[PDB]
Enzyme design. Structure first.
Site, short mmCIF file in Angstrom:
data_model
loop_
_atom_site.label_atom_id
_atom_site.label_comp_id
_atom_site.label_asym_id
_atom_site.label_seq_id
_atom_site.Cartn_x
_atom_site.Cartn_y
_atom_site.Cartn_z
N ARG B 10 42.62 -9.02 -1.86
CA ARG B 10 41.46 -9.80 -2.28
C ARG B 10 41.88 -11.15 -2.86
O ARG B 10 41.19 -12.16 -2.64
CB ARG B 10 40.64 -9.01 -3.29
N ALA B 433 35.93 -4.87 -11.22
CA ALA B 433 36.59 -6.04 -11.80
C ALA B 433 35.87 -6.50 -13.07
O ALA B 433 36.46 -6.53 -14.16
CB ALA B 433 36.65 -7.17 -10.77
N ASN B 467 42.19 -2.47 -5.74
CA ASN B 467 41.51 -2.75 -6.99
C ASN B 467 42.47 -3.28 -8.05
O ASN B 467 42.07 -4.10 -8.90
CB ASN B 467 40.84 -1.48 -7.53
N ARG B 470 42.99 -6.92 -9.86
CA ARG B 470 41.99 -7.54 -10.72
C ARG B 470 41.22 -6.54 -11.58
O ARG B 470 40.28 -6.95 -12.27
CB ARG B 470 41.00 -8.35 -9.88
N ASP B 533 28.75 -5.63 -7.26
CA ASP B 533 29.38 -6.38 -6.19
C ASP B 533 28.47 -6.54 -4.97
O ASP B 533 28.96 -6.83 -3.88
CB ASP B 533 30.71 -5.74 -5.78
N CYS B 589 22.53 -14.71 22.14
CA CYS B 589 23.16 -15.23 23.35
C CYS B 589 24.55 -15.80 23.06
O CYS B 589 25.44 -15.71 23.90
CB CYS B 589 22.27 -16.30 23.99
N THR B 590 24.74 -16.40 21.88
CA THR B 590 26.07 -16.85 21.49
C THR B 590 27.04 -15.68 21.42
O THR B 590 28.18 -15.78 21.88
CB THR B 590 26.00 -17.57 20.14
N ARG B 592 26.59 -12.72 22.97
CA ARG B 592 26.66 -12.01 24.24
C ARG B 592 27.46 -12.78 25.28
O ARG B 592 28.27 -12.20 26.00
CB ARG B 592 25.24 -11.75 24.76
N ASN B 770 19.23 -18.64 26.48
CA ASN B 770 18.80 -18.91 25.11
C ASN B 770 18.04 -17.71 24.56
O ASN B 770 17.46 -16.92 25.31
CB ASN B 770 17.92 -20.17 25.05
N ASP B 771 18.04 -17.59 23.23
CA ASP B 771 17.40 -16.45 22.59
C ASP B 771 15.89 -16.49 22.75
O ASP B 771 15.25 -15.44 22.90
CB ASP B 771 17.77 -16.40 21.11
#
EC number: 6.2.1.45
Lengths: 76, 1005
Positions: B10, B433, B467, B470, B533, B589-590, B592, B770-771
Site C-alpha cells: 500500500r 490504519a 496491514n 501502517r 475504508d 464500447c471502449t 468491448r 457508440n454506446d
C-alpha cells in the site's frame, strides 16, 4: 478581479470574478475550466467553506485571494 | 536491494520504487524520544529506511507518558533511548534501530543522511547542529510541540533535487491538430489538464517525426482544450495522430540555515484563517528557549502569569532584533504569547500526532526527493480545542501536576476536563490504519478509562501482512487474528488504565447487525468515531448518528491526502449531506472494442477472469443442482445467449488432465487476441472511413493487430500458464506443483502439437460503435445441446474467489497477462503485475504518516465534543496533502433549516416521534390535527404504503391497518421481532394545500 483556486493536486486555477458573484456562479466557472460538477466542489477560504447562495464578498474574498478546492477521501 | 511487495504494497503505491530504494539507503538520526520523537521514529521505521538511530539519554519520567506510547511506568529512571529502542525495532525487521549513547562529538553526525532535532534539543544546539549539517550536506529537520502549539523547520541544504513535486499520475491526452506555431488542439472535448510551465513529450504524431523522440516542450495553456509548445515548423507538418505525456522535470531548490531563517523565515501556513499567527509564534518559540536559558533550562510555569509577562518581554525584545519577522507597526499578539507560555509544558497527543506524521513525511522527502519539501517553517495551534473556561476553569491549581501520566495534558486542560475524557463513552467503527492510530491516541488520553466511561471498537476484518506497514499495533505473529481484539490488547499494554474498559467486537456495522447494535447500545454513547475504508460504511454510520443524535468524528486518507469532518447534532450538516466525485465510467464500447488505456484492458481482463473461472463455475453448478435453472435463465437473464453457451462449453470441453487445460488456454488466446480481432478488422478495416470521409480508426479508436502466439513473449506465456492453472482449479485437476515455476519447454511441447483452427469471418455480425447507438429457436439450439444433469452426478466446479494479495494463486498473473495481450492488440503500453494489482485489486494507497496526522486532527476536534461546544465557528474540518505540503481547515456547514405552517425545523436532525403501532388513519388524522399537515405520501424505505391519490378501494384495505401490518401488506414479509423503531418518510401539503418539505417520522413500537 483575479482570484486563484488551488486543488489538492497543486494545480492553480485563475478565475476572473466580481465581489457580488455567487458561489454557485464561481463553481460553474470552475466547471468550465476543470470539468468538475458544482455538486462535487468543496471550496474553502480563510477558515470557511463557501456555500451556494452567498457571494464572494460575504466571505471577504479579495483581489488575488486564493481559494482551495478540497476533497474527502475514503481510505482508512 | 529489491522491495518487498508483501509488506510495502500500500505504501509502494504512494512513494514508488525509486523513492523507497533511495529511502533504504538512508540512515536517519532522531534526537529526542519524547512523544514527538517516538512518533516520528515510528512512522519512519514503518516506512523503511536503511537504519534508524535514536538519541535520548534522559531518564524516563512519569510525565513523559503523556504522549510517549512506548514508555511504561515501570521504565521510570531508565534512559528513554534505551527503553524505546526495542519497541521501535519490532515495527520493521528490515530496519535496524540503534541507540546513540553520546553526542558530545558532533562529527558523529557525518554518518547520517538526515538528522531530526525534536523538543529535547535547545535552540543553541539546533543552530550548531544545523550549521554542521548544512555545511556537510546532511539534511536537517527540527520540530517542537508546546501544548496546543507546534512547529517544524526543514533545511535540506544548498542544492536539493525534487524529482517529483506531487506524485500525481502524469497527465496524458490525444492530439487532434498541431499547427506550425505549436498550437496543440485536443481531441473532441478532452481536457489536457495541464498547467503553464508543465513539460510534455509526444508519441505517434505523424508529420512531425522528431517531435516524438522524447524532447520536452514547455506548455502555454490556451483554455481547457488547447495549449502551445512553440513553433514546430522545423519538425515537419502535422498529419494526424498524437499522444502527449506530461513529464515532471527535476527541480533544484536551495534552503537557508536555521540561523538565517530565525531572522528571515519563510513560512508554509497550516491554517489561512491564522496566517497572522505564524510570525507571532515564530518569535514565541524562540522566546521560550531564551526563557529556559535564563531559568536553568526550565520552561515557563504552567498557567503562570509572571512567566507569561516575561515571555512577552522576551518576544518584544526579539522583535527588535528580528524586525523582518513581524514587519513594521505590527504589535506583539500578547494574548497569543501568554497562551504559549501558559501551555509551554503541555504534551498533547493530537498535536504530537499531527507533527509526528508531517515531520516523518518530511524525513521521507529528504531521503528520496519525492514530493515538495516544506520550505521552511510551519507553525500550528489548535487553541479552539480549549474548553470554555466557564465550564472548566484554567488556573494554577486546576492545571497543577497530580503525579500521573496525564500531568502534561492536565497542564493545558485541567483535572476535571481530563476526568470527563476518562468517563466518556465512545464507539469506534473500524480497527485498521486509522483505528490503530485512534486507539493509541485514546490510550494516551485515557479516554474511557473512568468508571462511567468505556470504549467499544468493532471490526470484522482479520489481520493481514499488508496491514502491518501502517497498522502498528499488529505484529507478524498476529496475522490471522482479529484486528479489534489484538488492537485492544496492544493499547492496554500501553496504558493499563484501559484494562477492562475496551469492548472489542468483530461485528460489521450495517443493516444486518442492528440487533447487536440496537437502540440501547447507541443511546448510551457520548459520540462515535469512524475508522472506515469505504463510503457505504460511512454513510450507514452517518444515518445512525443522525437518527440517534450522536456527534460523529469522520476522517479518511488516500496516500498523502487526508481529511477530517465533524458532525454535530442540530448544528452541522451530516456526512451524507454532501457528495464526493464518483468513480469514472468507461463506455461499454471502449471496453468491448476500442480500448486506448491500460485501465480499459485491465477491466476487460478482470471481467474475462470472472467469466472464465467464477461465473462459469457457479452457472454450471446451479444448472446441475437447480431443477428450474434453464427456463429461469430464459425468463431472467441479461445474456441468455452466453449464459447457456458458457454451460455448454464448460461441460462439452471438460479437461481430464493439465495438458487439456493448456490446450484450452492456448485456444482462448487464439480466440480473444487473434480471431476476435480479425473479426473486428473485417467489420472495420485498417483504412475504413466514416461518412464524412475521416478515418474510422482515429483518436480513441486504435486499429488493432492480431497476435501470433509466441511463448517467449512474457504475456503470451503467462496467459496460458495462469489460464490453464485456473482451469485446473475449477475442475480439480492437479498442476505440476504450486511453488514450482513453470517450464516454457513443457508448455511449448503441448502447444506445438496443437492444430489451431483458422479464422473464418462471420459476415453477419454487427459491432456496436457508440454506446448511444442501436445493436428463439437459435436459443433452443443451445438448450437442446446441454447435457443431462443426471449424467453428471456428484460433479461440481470449484469457483475462483478473487484474492489480489496472494501472489501464488495466479489471479493477478492472469489479469496482467490477459490485459497486456489486449494492450499488444491495440498498441497500448503494457503494465506489470504491481500496477495491474493496483487497478484490478482497487487498492487504496496508504501510508502511516497521513494516517497518524489525520488521527491527530480528529483528537483535537474530540476535545470540542467533550465541552459540548455549540458555536460552529470553533469546529474545524481538516484537509491535507502532505506531498505539497498543504493544510487547510474550514468551519463545518450548518444544517439547513426549513419551515412548514410557520413552524421552523432542522432538515437533518428533527423528526416526528409517535408512540405505538398507530393505524394509518390515525396517523393521517394526527398530522392534520396536531401538525397542520395533509399526508400525501407515506413510505417505509422502498415500499409505498399510502398516497392520497390511492382510490377508495385501495384505501379501505389500508386505512385501518397498524403500520407494521400495513408494511406486511405491501412487502409480504413483515417486521423482525427485535425492531423497536420504524422510520417513515412522508410528503405532505401545508394548510394552503401547497406541498412542503417535512421531517421524517419515527414509530416507537
Amino acid at each position: 478581479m483575479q482570484i486563484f483556486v488551488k486543488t489538492l493536486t497543486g494545480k492553480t486555477i485563475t478565475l476572473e470574478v466580481e465581489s457580488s458573484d455567487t458561489i454557485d456562479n464561481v463553481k460553474s466557472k470552475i466547471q468550465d475550466k476543470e470539468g468538475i460538477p458544482p455538486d462535487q466542489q468543496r471550496l474553502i477560504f480563510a477558515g470557511k467553506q463557501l456555500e451556494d447562495g452567498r457571494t464572494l464578498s460575504d466571505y471577504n474574498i479579495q483581489k488575488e485571494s486564493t481559494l482551495h478546492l478540497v476533497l474527502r477521501l475514503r481510505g482508512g | 536491494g529489491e522491495i518487498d511487495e508483501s509488506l510495502y504494497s500500500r505504501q509502494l503505491y504512494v512513494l514508488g520504487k525509486e523513492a523507497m530504494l533511495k529511502m533504504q539507503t538512508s540512515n536517519v538520526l532522531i534526537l529526542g524520544l519524547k512523544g514527538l520523537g517516538v512518533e516520528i521514529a515510528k512512522n519512519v521505521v514503518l516506512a523503511g529506511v536503511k537504519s534508524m538511530t535514536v538519541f535520548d539519554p534522559e531518564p524516563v519520567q512519569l510525565a513523559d507518558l503523556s504522549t510517549q506510547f512506548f514508555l511504561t511506568e515501570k521504565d521510570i529512571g531508565q534512559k528513554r533511548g534505551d527503553v524505546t529502542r526495542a519497541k521501535l525495532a519490532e515495527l520493521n525487521a528490515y530496519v535496524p534501530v540503534n541507540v546513540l549513547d553520546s553526542l558530545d562529538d558532533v562529527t558523529q553526525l557525518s554518518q547520517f543522511q538526515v538528522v531530526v532535532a525534536t523538543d529535547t534539543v535547545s535552540l543553541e544546539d539546533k543552530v550548531k547542529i544545523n550549521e554542521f549539517c548544512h555545511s556537510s550536506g546532511i539534511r536537517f529537520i527540527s520540530s517542537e510541540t508546546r501544548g496546543l502549539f507546534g512547529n517544524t523547520f526543514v533545511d535540506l541544504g544548498d542544492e536539493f533535487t525534487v524529482l517529483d513535486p506531487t506524485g500525481e499520475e502524469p497527465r496524458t491526452g490525444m492530439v487532434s491538430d498541431i499547427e506550425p506555431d505549436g498550437t496543440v488542439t485536443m481531441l473532441d472535448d478532452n481536457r489536457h489538464g495541464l498547467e503553464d510551465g508543465n513539460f510534455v513529450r509526444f508519441s505517434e504524431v505523424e508529420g512531425l517525426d522528431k517531435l516524438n523522440d522524447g524532447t520536452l516542450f514547455k506548455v502555454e495553456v490556451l483554455g481547457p482544450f488547447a495549449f502551445r509548445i512553440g513553433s514546430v515548423k522545423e519538425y515537419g507538418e502535422y498529419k494526424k495522430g498524437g499522444i502527449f505525456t506530461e513529464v515532471k522535470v527535476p527541480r533544484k531548490i536551495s534552503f537557508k540555515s536555521l540561523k538565517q531563517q530565525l531572522s528571515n523565515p519563510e513560512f508554509v501556513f497550516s491554517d489561512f484563517a491564522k496566517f497572522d499567527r505564524a510570525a507571532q509564534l515564530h518569535l514565541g518559540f524562540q522566546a521560550l528557549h531564551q526563557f529556559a536559558v535564563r531559568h536553568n533550562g526550565e520552561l515557563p510555569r504552567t498557567m503562570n502569569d509572571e512567566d507569561a509577562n516575561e515571555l512577552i518581554k522576551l518576544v518584544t525584545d526579539l522583535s527588535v532584533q528580528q524586525p523582518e519577522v513581524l514587519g513594521e507597526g505590527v504589535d506583539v499578539n500578547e494574548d497569543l504569547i501568554k497562551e504559549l507560555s501558559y501551555q509551554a509544558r503541555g504534551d498533547i497527543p493530537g498535536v504530537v500526532a499531527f507533527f509526528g506524521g508531517l515531520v516523518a513525511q518530511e524525513v521521507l522527502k529528504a531521503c528520496s526527493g519525492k514530493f515538495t519539501p516544506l520550505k521552511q517553517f510551519m507553525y500550528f495551534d489548535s487553541l479552539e480545542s480549549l474548553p470554555d473556561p466557564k465550564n472548566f476553569p484554567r488556573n494554577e491549581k486546576t492545571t497543577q501536576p497530580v503525579n500521573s501520566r496525564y500531568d502534561n495534558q492536565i497542564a493545558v486542560f485541567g483535572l476535571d476536563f481530563q476526568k470527563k475524557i476518562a468517563n466518556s463513552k465512545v464507539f469506534l467503527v473500524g480497527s485498521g490504519a486509522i483505528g490503530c492510530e485512534m486507539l493509541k491516541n485514546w490510550a494516551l488520553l485515557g479516554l474511557g478509562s473512568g468508571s462511567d466511561g468505556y470504549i467499544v471498537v468493532t471490526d470484522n476484518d482479520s489481520i493481514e501482512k499488508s496491514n502491518l506497514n501502517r497498522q502498528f499495533l499488529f505484529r507478524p505473529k498476529d496475522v490471522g487474528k482479529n484486528k479489534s481484539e489484538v488492537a485492544a490488547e496492544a493499547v492496554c499494554a500501553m496504558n493499563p488504565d484501559l484494562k477492562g474498559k475496551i469492548n472489542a467486537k468483530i461485528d460489521k456495522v450495517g443493516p444486518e447487525t442492528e440487533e447487536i447494535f440496537n437502540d440501547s447500545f447507541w443511546e448510551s454513547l457520548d459520540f462515535v468515531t469512524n475508522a472506515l475504508d469505504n463510503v457505504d460504511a460511512r454513510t450507514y454510520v452517518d444515518r445512525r448518528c443522525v437518527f440517534y443524535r450522536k456527534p460523529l468524528l469522520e476522517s479518511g486518507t488516500l496516500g498523502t491526502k487526508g481529511n477530517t469532518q465533524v458532525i454535530i447534532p442540530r448544528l452541522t450538516e451530516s456526512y451524507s449531506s454532501s457528495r464526493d466525485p464518483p468513480e469514472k465510467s468507461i463506455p461499454l464500447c471502449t471496453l468491448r472494442s476500442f480500448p486506448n488505456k491500460i485501465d480499459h484492458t485491465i477491466a476487460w481482463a478482470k471481467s474475462l477472469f470472472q467469466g472464465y473461472f467464477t461465473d462459469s463455475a457457479e452457472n454450471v453448478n446451479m444448472y446441475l443442482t437447480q431443477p428450474n435453472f434453464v427456463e429461469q435463465t430464459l425468463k431472467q437473464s441479461g445474456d441468455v445467449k452466453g449464459v447457456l453457451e458458457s454451460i455448454s462449453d464448460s461441460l462439452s470441453s471438460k479437461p481430464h488432465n493439465f495438458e487439456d487445460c493448456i490446450k484450452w488456454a492456448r485456444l482462448e488466446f487464439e480466440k480473444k487476441f487473434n480471431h476476435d480481432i480479425k473479426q473486428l478488422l473485417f467489420n472495420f478495416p485498417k483504412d475504413a472511413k466514416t461518412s464524412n470521409g475521416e478515418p474510422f480508426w482515429s483518436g480513441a479508436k486504435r486499429a488493432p493487430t492480431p497476435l501470433e502466439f509466441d511463448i517467449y513473449n512474457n504475456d503470451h506465456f503467462h496467459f496460458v500458464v495462469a489460464g490453464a492453472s485456473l482451469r485446473a482449479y475449477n475442475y480439480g485437476i492437479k498442476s505440476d506443483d504450486s511453488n514450482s515455476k513453470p517450464n516454457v519447454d513443457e508448455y511449448k511441447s503441448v502447444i506445438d502439437h496443437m492444430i489451431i483452427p483458422e479464422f473464418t469471418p462471420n459476415a453477419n455480425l454487427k459491432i456496436q460503435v457508440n454506446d448511444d447507438d442501436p445493436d428463439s429457436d437459435e436459443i433452443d439450439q443451445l438448450v437442446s445441446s446441454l447435457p443431462d444433469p443426471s449424467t453428471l452426478a456428484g460433479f461440481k466446479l470449484e469457483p475462483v474467489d478473487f484474492e489480489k494479495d496472494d501472489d501464488t494463486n495466479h489471479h493477478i498473473e492472469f489479469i496482467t497477462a490477459c490485459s497486456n495481450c489486449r494492450a499488444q492488440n491495440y498498441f497500448i503500453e503494457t503494465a506489470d503485475r504491481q500496477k495491474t494489482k493496483f487497478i484490478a485489486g482497487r487498492i487504496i494507497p496508504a501510508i502511516a504518516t497521513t494516517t497518524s496526522l489525520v488521527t491527530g486532527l480528529v483528537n483535537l476536534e474530540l476535545y470540542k465534543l467533550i465541552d459540548n461546544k455549540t458555536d460552529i465557528e470553533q469546529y474545524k474540518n481538516g484537509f491535507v496533502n502532505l506531498a505539497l505540503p498543504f493544510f487547510g481547515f474550514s468551519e463545518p456547514i450548518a444544517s439547513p433549516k426549513g419551515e412548514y405552517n410557520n413552524k421552523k425545523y432542522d432538515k437533518i436532525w428533527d423528526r416526528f416521534d409517535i408512540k405505538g403501532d398507530i393505524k394509518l388513519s390515525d396517523l393521517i388524522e394526527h398530522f392534520e390535527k396536531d401538525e397542520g399537515l395533509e399526508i400525501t405520501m407515506l413510505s417505509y424505505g422502498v415500499s409505498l404504503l399510502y398516497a392520497s391519490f390511492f382510490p377508495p378501494k385501495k384505501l379501505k384495505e389500508r386505512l385501518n391497518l397498524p403500520i407494521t401490518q400495513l408494511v406486511k401488506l405491501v412487502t409480504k414479509k413483515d417486521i423482525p421481532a427485535h425492531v423497536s423503531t420504524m422510520i417513515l418518510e412522508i410528503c405532505a401539503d401545508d394548510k394552503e394545500g401547497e406541498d412542503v418539505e417535512v421531517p421524517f417520522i419515527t414509530i416507537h413500537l
